[PDB]
């Protein structure tokens, strides 16, 4: 994985260059965004279980997905689904903190689509729940932090589709 | 950087970063302006810094530019100066990242295997970075020199110890 | 069922089932008619059984249907009755299989994580299945009640412990 | 894996239904077949080595398969082949006892065809030997149990082809 | 052969063969002419060797060719003689390779499982190879018989154990 | 793996034959080549680091490969490349000693091309370095041993292409 600083450093290193003005401007942007990112990470950590249960209530409960024939039927599958959502929120928070999506490619999305397809986990419904996580999260961390989290939750969704 | 370090530890423990870890990230990110000033000063003064350094290095080790020496002849000597500029550049990366990771992954893992294969004496490299440190820190404020010295020291210690 | 369990043990040990294991299977398979009678009696009387059970449940726990309670309001209360019918159905599966496996895989693994996420009190579920057991066993013969009780008990113990 | 009872239960569960009359009739058939299945399993267990050596004698011995260039040549390959046949008989007996072929899909056939084709194990000759196992088994367990065993030995053969 | 054995050990230890291992290979490769002479002598005399051997074998074990015996009847007896020629052939491979490997991989791993499945007595096979050894060594010089005896002995010992 | 002797034995074994005259002639050739092979193995072992160092200097140093954007840039990749060359030399020496390329198929080339293409390791430059290893080795072990080593170093190159 890389965070936003290592990403800019790597782009320079592979050219054998010191960081130029444009590169330093990218670092300045990330350094200045520190308070935003750290506060949002603290809020999400403190509210992680609530965010997931509210997202599930909005997007999945009382639907076909939780009835026999649906992929959340059986307590075992219900719990597995919740666990997935716990994962997506935690890893999106990592990526938001890092200002970089690489940890998502390396540790979330790698072979995930094939795993779901083999098991019959519905992509459409999963993406709907992640989108619900995005909106619940935004209601708590505010508009500006909500946008950053939205980038990385959207990233996971795009990677599944 | 410091941020990815925290994230890797948290992920290893299947948890969010702790309040303590987040405080540490906050403190790191407010020190950005200083790190950028240091990086630009070293970049701007690369030629001057490398020149002072190489002058001291080959005063101590004239045998490196004598026949049979690894830096004998202009092409080889110029490649040494090239390497010097590269390690100065890696130090600026370390300062910006707040840790040794960008230095280690690009210029230290395998460094002994490389220079041994090139017949460049590793103790010569230890001596080289020592006087690079001297030259570079001399162009910084006292505060900035103290901030920067550990990144040189890490290189020097790495190249000294097996 | 009982048969699968024996086969999994035998396969684990790279062997055929033992004479003892086969005798156990034979004994299980001769008790089929009783198990089918129990399953059909509980199925036929589902509405009556669930009604008796929910009446006792909410006499003990009226707060569940008061404001702020998890079963407050018609849609939520009706979903509780739905769950009740589902656990009764799982008990009939257990009786037919002669073990807890179909109950565990469908209704117990992850059950605490699920109901916690729903804000349904797990001790409430323990109390619910306890009076479900009372209502169901009351419609069976003494012999059949004894056969059926451990399947309810397994659910109750699971929701109580760890 | 599932046995015949769990298979019927699962068909009901995925619909959220109690077992209806047709489902109960399937269970009754399986419960009634208990004596047949248990007796056959005991006979096969007691005679497992004899069944395999007699099948091999009928289908593979004195043929090209056991001469140089054939896949049973060398004592190492001969013994490996016997071991496969031991497997097929034991797992077919499991499936017969369970009244369900799922254990064959999960623990025998999974990746087996690919394994044989990579090793050069002849499918045709393997199927001939399993068919010989079916007929030797039938001679010992009788006509009726022989039919049940035949279903599951045939299942393995179809899975290889 | 002896060569591949050294190479496998070296590879296991991520190293080149040692001076000692190389000397051993050198010594083995200069003994090639002897091994070829032995192999051709046994090949040339196969029919005579197998005939002497089978005569002694069935003088000791006439029950093998009596009713109910594994070698009863011409087709079965001839298959024993076939096997005899095969083990003689494997011994020539062992002599050429300078180790037991070609004998083991073709004729010993799984040999007891095979002959048990065929109802051929493994102690009969031990006795068979014992008199095969006698017949074969009788056609070699003293020196060559000493070189060859261990390959027969390896087969005999393998079939006696486990 | 097989050495030259086991290869000839196997060709006979799969036919159920004693080694004929042509087969014995192959063995005689290998036995007679013993001094050549053992001497070369000793020389290469004693000089393995020098051979690789000199090959790299001839084929890779001061080129695009060792500058930023090239696959040997960074001390980590530089050292990994050297390690690969150490491997190729050691395994070619094994194969030369054995007079057989099977150890190369089994322990070097197996999945190697795919590994390199996934990592972005350049095949062209690797093959150039191995060819340089061939010529340096030949300068030390002589013409005749050089030819044998050349067979197996060329074999590795063909396997990468
Ligand atoms: C919930 C929104 C939906 C749902 C999910 C569901 N997922 C699984 C099983 C798996 N999910 C994962 C996912 C991950 N594992 C990881 O390590 C990571 C990364 C950080 C992820 C994203 C995996 C690997 C599995 C399979 C292995 C396992 O179970 O641990 C299931 C269970 C499927 C089954 O029957 O076994 C389900 C039900 N299903 C829904 O319907 C939802 C919309
Ligand atoms: C100068 C202070 C010392 C010195 C150096 C010297 N180096 C070389 C040749 C090479 N140096 C490198 C260095 C790197 N490759 C990397 O990926 C990195 C990491 C960022 C480094 C530092 C390389 C690859 C070479 C080889 C040639 C090439 O660039 O392809 C020389 C040339 C002579 C030789 O190889 O022996 C020298 C002289 N010599 C000194 O005396 C100093 C102590
Ligand atoms: C009734 C005795 C208790 C009670 C229950 C109650 N449950 C819900 C909501 C849900 N129940 C389930 C249950 C299951 N899903 C399964 O796969 C299985 C296994 C067979 C079960 C048992 C689910 C998924 C829901 C969520 C909605 C949906 O069906 O999608 C409620 C609704 C309100 C809430 O969620 O809090 C209630 C009230 N409440 C009681 O007081 C009783 C002790
Ligand atoms: C005998 C009828 C034929 C024959 C068979 C033969 N098989 C192998 C090798 C393997 N067979 C298996 C089969 C299984 N392994 C399992 O765990 C299971 C399932 C429960 C099965 C069915 C496997 C995995 C192998 C490869 C691994 C191993 O050997 O354990 C061989 C040996 C091939 C070789 O040269 O290594 C042979 C000879 N060959 C015939 O000619 C027969 C017709
Ligand atoms: C003769 C000294 C003894 C003897 C032997 C005997 N063998 C058989 C039948 C078979 N022998 C083999 C042998 C091998 N297959 C191999 O791959 C190898 C390794 C090189 C060997 C040695 C086989 C496969 C058979 C089966 C038939 C076939 O060839 O397909 C018999 C036939 C009767 C029987 O099977 O019982 C006999 C009689 N019997 C003796 O009494 C001797 C001690
Ligand atoms: C005995 C068999 C064997 C081989 C052959 C082998 C090769 C080997 N080379 C690798 C990497 C590598 N190989 C090189 C090689 C080079 N890059 C260049 O530009 C050069 C032209 C070249 C040197 C000639 C590089 C740079 C890597 C590192 C790639 C990376 O991780 O970025 C890797 C990936 C894993 C690792 O780094 O250890 C393997 C497996 N490993 C084995 O076990």
């Amino acid at each position: 994985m890389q965070d936003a600083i290592t990403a800019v450093i790597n782009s320079a290193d592979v050219q054998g260059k010191y960081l130029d003005g444009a590169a330093m401007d990218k670092l300045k942007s990330y350094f200045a965004s520190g308070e935003l990112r750290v506060r949002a990470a603290s809020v999400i950590s403190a509210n992680a279980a609530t965010i997931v249960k509210e997202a599930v209530a909005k997007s999945l409960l009382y639907s076909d997905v939780t009835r026999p024939g649906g992929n959340m039927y059986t307590t075992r599958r219900y719990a597995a689904c919740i666990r997935d959502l716990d994962y997506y929120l935690r890893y999106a928070t990592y990526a938001m903190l890092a200002g970089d999506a690489s940890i998502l490619d390396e540790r979330v999305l790698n072979g995930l689509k094939e795993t779901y397809n083999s098991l019959g986990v519905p992509i459409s419904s999963t993406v709907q729940a992640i989108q619900a996580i995005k909106e619940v999260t935004a209601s708590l961390v505010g508009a500006d932090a909500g946008k950053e989290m939205g980038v990385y939750l959207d990233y996971i969704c795009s990677g599944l589709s | 950087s410091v941020v990815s370090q925290v994230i890797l530890q948290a992920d290893d423990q299947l948890r969010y970063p702790t309040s303590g870890e987040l405080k540490g990230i906050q403190a790191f990110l407010t020190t950005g302006a200083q790190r950028i000033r240091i990086a630009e000063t070293l970049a701007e003064n690369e030629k001057k810094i490398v020149d002072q350094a190489q002058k001291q290095l080959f005063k101590k080790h004239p045998e490196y530019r004598a026949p049979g020496g690894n830096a004998y002849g202009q092409r080889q000597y110029n490649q040494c100066l090239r390497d010097y500029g590269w390690y100065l550049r890696l130090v600026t990366y370390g300062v910006l990242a707040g840790n040794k990771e960008p230095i280690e992954t690009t210029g230290l893992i395998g460094v002994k295997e490389m220079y041994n294969s090139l017949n460049v004496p590793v103790p010569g490299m230890v001596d080289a970075v020592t006087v690079l440190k001297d030259a570079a820190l001399g162009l910084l404020s006292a505060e900035d020199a103290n901030e920067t010295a550990p990144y040189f020291d890490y290189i020097i210690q790495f190249m000294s110890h097996h």
Side-chain angles (χ1 to χ4, degrees), chain A, chain B:
Chain A
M1 87 163 278
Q2 316 114 46
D3 57 43
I5 298 166
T6 292
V8 172
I9 288 170
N10 287 343
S11 294
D13 188 35
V14 71
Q15 305 181 80
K17 289 175 177 171
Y18 294 84
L19 276 69
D20 61 10
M24 294 303 195
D25 288 342
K26 286 187 168 70
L27 292 189
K28 288 179 186 170
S29 293
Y30 180 65
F31 284 121
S33 73
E35 279 77 5
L36 172 305
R37 299 188 194 267
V38 160
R39 176 72 76 184
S42 300
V43 165
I44 294 163
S45 173
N47 291 282
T50 299
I51 288 166
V52 169
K53 73 172 59 170
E54 291 180 355
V56 170
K58 294 195 183 208
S59 62
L60 301 166
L61 295 189
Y62 293 99
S63 73
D64 294 273
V65 183
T66 53
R67 292 194 284 273
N71 196 239
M72 282 179 86
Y73 174 76
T74 73
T75 52
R76 184 189 66 85
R77 289 187 164 154
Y78 192 110
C81 175
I82 298 315
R83 182 220 41 204
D84 283 13
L85 296 179
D86 292 341
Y87 281 149
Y88 296 135
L89 184 55
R90 179 160 57 84
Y91 278 99
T93 306
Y94 294 159
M96 180 275 301
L97 201 49
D100 191 277
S102 58
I103 189 174
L104 303 176
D105 291 318
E106 298 182 4
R107 295 186 185 206
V108 176
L109 292 171
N110 49 314
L112 183 53
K113 186 160 50 263
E114 179 270 327
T115 296
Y116 280 174
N117 287 338
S118 176
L119 288 172
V121 175
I123 300 299
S124 66
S125 306
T126 295
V127 162
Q128 292 164 30
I130 298 172
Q131 289 295 296
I133 288 179
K134 177 174 67 167
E135 304 304 345
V136 174
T137 297
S139 73
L140 289 175
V141 304
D144 296 334
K147 257 186 60 178
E148 274 307 291
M149 284 298 299
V151 168
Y152 298 106
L153 291 164
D154 280 351
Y155 193 89
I156 295 173
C157 291
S158 300
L160 286 171
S161 312
Chain B
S1 79
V2 171
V3 178
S4 58
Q5 237 176 353
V6 161
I7 287 163
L8 290 175
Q9 288 182 353
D11 192 28
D12 189 86
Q13 301 210 273
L14 277 53
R15 64 172 171 78
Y16 286 85
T18 62
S19 57
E21 287 167 333
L22 288 169
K23 292 186 186 82
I25 288 173
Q26 207 158 206
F28 165 66
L29 292 179
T30 65
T31 68
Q34 174 184 22
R35 296 171 189 280
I36 292 174
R37 284 193 276 96
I38 291 163
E40 284 175 338
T41 296
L42 299 183
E44 279 170 34
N45 288 283
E46 181 191 57
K47 182 184 178 188
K48 175 179 184 172
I49 289 164
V50 171
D51 190 48
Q52 289 180 17
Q54 65 89 16
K55 280 178 182 175
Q56 289 308 291
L57 176 63
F58 294 116
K59 274 174 176 176
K60 180 183 224 297
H61 290 289
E63 69 275 13
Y64 294 172
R65 297 179 75 182
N70 83 96
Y72 183 66
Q74 182 154 239
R75 184 190 65 173
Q76 289 64 232
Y77 167 76
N78 282 333
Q79 211 71 349
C80 172
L81 303 192
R82 191 283 307 271
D83 289 7
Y84 248 153
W86 278 1
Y87 276 107
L88 186 61
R89 174 170 60 83
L90 299 188
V91 169
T92 72
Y93 297 166
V95 168
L96 293 163
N99 68 26
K100 70 228 175 47
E101 178 78 354
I103 305 174
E104 192 168 2
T105 60
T106 292
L108 301 176
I109 300 170
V111 67
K112 292 186 171 172
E113 290 94 324
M114 179 186 79
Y115 276 124
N116 285 335
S117 75
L118 298 170
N119 302 316
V120 180
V122 173
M125 284 299 299
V126 169
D127 289 351
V129 179
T130 294
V131 292
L132 185 66
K133 181 194 180 186
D134 290 338
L137 300 190
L139 299 183
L140 305 170
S141 70
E143 173 105 336
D144 288 348
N146 287 348
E147 179 81 357
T148 307
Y151 296 92
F152 283 105
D153 285 337
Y154 189 75
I155 297 168
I156 293 158
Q157 260 37 74
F158 192 101
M159 294 175 172
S160 307
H161 304 127
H162 297 294

